[PDB]
Swiss-Prot record:
This is Adenosine receptor A2a. Its main location: membrane. One of its GO terms (cellular component) is presynaptic active zone. The chain holds residues 4 to 311 of 412 of the full protein. Disulfide bonds join C68-C146, C71-C143, C74-C153, C335-C338. It comes from Homo sapiens (Human). Adenosine binds at E156, N329, S353, H354.
């Protein structure tokens, strides 16, 4: 029977959505390291994911087939998952904003994103999600056309199809959904490419520094030095130290290149052994002046890629799960002449949306390493409090 597989899966998902996200909250709370403000919103997301696994899913199973209830009451069952959805779109929105305010402006952050302003941002969304989510209950419903005073609750017969498309989807979801991927797919892409270039330069001058020490004639030296001077110049304009004022950075490269030129001058003059002797100085010159920034830059990007990629995946799946259900509501509203999407497809669109509140923990398990071994960290944190 298909109906059992539905309720079987519906309950199965509800279990994971609860257990998965509840684990996140323990790690976010038990583990001290995972207590960064960015996880404050991770909790708001997991809290909404928990509410979906507890209340939303049962509410869905019931309205799946309809039921007799008041119009002012049945809107809760049908339009409660709406609040949890907008809350998610608000939580992801914050994490996307919290991560951007730290990638492009790592300076004015700890004075810009305090623990208190964050706590207020979350509540203002839930009360605004309750407002956006439970909007049809203010007096925008189709329960006009059971017992005395009760109306047949079936969603599409109660929820205005123009509220799910124009407002909920377009304004409250589609706008924010596109807003986040377009930014972090670029940040993840620009960073992805930028990190690759920075390494090819560090490796090309690190490699060509060796070809000079073990070189035969003056040609090999003149050619490597040229390739080195290319990498240094490329790296020079590629590693801005955030923050021309107070930059002991442009001086660094100009000390390095200054010796590459003296070396090319040596090689060009046919002084190979004398030119390769200056190559060892370059190692010392690289380690002394430039090595500091090469590493500092390669680290900042490894965080941009891992964070944008992570946040992109979270938002990526969130948009990949909630779109089919919104696409149907669009193909249904803009083409009333089209046959309404079949239940077997409608059901499949509802079931998928419930999964988004399950992947988040899995994503964190496949991405956040701290959250991963956080159990062994909680244990050790307790056994240590014994001597
Ligand atoms: C017959 O199909 C079902 C299967 C399981 C449970 C309920 C139903 C009835 N459909 C619905 N309640 C239903 N929700 N939608 C919906 C669309 C976007 C966002 C949110 C939160 C909800 N869009 C709908 N059509
Ligand atoms: O989801 C993200 O934005 C990426 N992580 C960054 C990675 N995390 C986990 C880790 O790699 O240790 C850093 C952290 O929590 O210490 C943000 C966050 O920490 O909340």
């Amino acid at each position: 029977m298909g109906s059992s597989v539905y309720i079987t899966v519906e309950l199965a998902i509800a279990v994971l959505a609860i257990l998965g996200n509840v684990l996140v909250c323990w790690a976010v709370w038990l583990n001290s390291n995972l207590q960064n403000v960015t996880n404050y919103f991770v909790v708001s997301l997991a809290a909404a994911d928990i509410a979906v696994g507890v209340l939303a899913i049962p509410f869905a199973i019931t309205i799946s087939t309809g039921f007799c209830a008041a119009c002012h009451g049945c809107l809760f069952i049908a339009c409660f998952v709406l609040v949890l959805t907008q809350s998610s779109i608000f939580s992801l929105l914050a994490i996307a904003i919290d991560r951007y305010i730290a990638i492009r402006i790592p300076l004015r952050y700890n004075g810009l994103v305090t623990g208190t302003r964050a706590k207020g941002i979350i509540a203002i969304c839930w009360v605004l999600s309750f407002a956006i989510g439970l909007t049809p209950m203010l007096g925008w419903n189709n329960c006009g056309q059971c017992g005395e005073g009760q109306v047949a609750c079936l969603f599409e017969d109660v929820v205005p199809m123009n509220y799910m498309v124009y407002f909920n989807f377009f304004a409250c979801v589609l706008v924010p959904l596109l807003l986040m991927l377009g930014v972090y797919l670029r940040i993840f892409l620009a960073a992805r490419r930028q990190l690759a270039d920075l390494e090819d330069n560090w490796e090309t001058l690190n490699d060509n520094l060796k070809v000079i020490e073990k070189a035969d004639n003056a040609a090999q030296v003149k050619d490597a030095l040229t390739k080195m001077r290319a990498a240094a110049l490329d790296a020079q304009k590629a590693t801005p130290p955030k923050l021309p004022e107070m930059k002991d950075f442009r001086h660094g490269f100009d000390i390095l290149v200054g010796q590459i030129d003296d070396a090319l001058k040596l090689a060009n003059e046919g002084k190979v052994k004398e030119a390769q002797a200056a190559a060892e100085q370059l190692k010392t010159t690289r380690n002394a002046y430039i090595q500091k920034y090469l590493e500092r830059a390669r680290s900042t990007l490894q965080k941009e890629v891992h964070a944008a990629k992570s946040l992109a995946i979270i938002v990526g799946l969130f948009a990949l799960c909630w779109l089919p259900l919104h696409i149907i509501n669009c193909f249904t509203f803009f083409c009333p002449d089209c046959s309404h999407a079949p239940l077997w497809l409608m059901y499949l669109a509802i079931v998928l949306s419930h999964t988004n509140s399950v992947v988040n923990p899995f994503i964190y398990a496949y991405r956040i390493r701290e959250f991963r071994q956080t159990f062994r960290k909680i244990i050790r944190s307790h056994v240590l409090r014994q001597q």
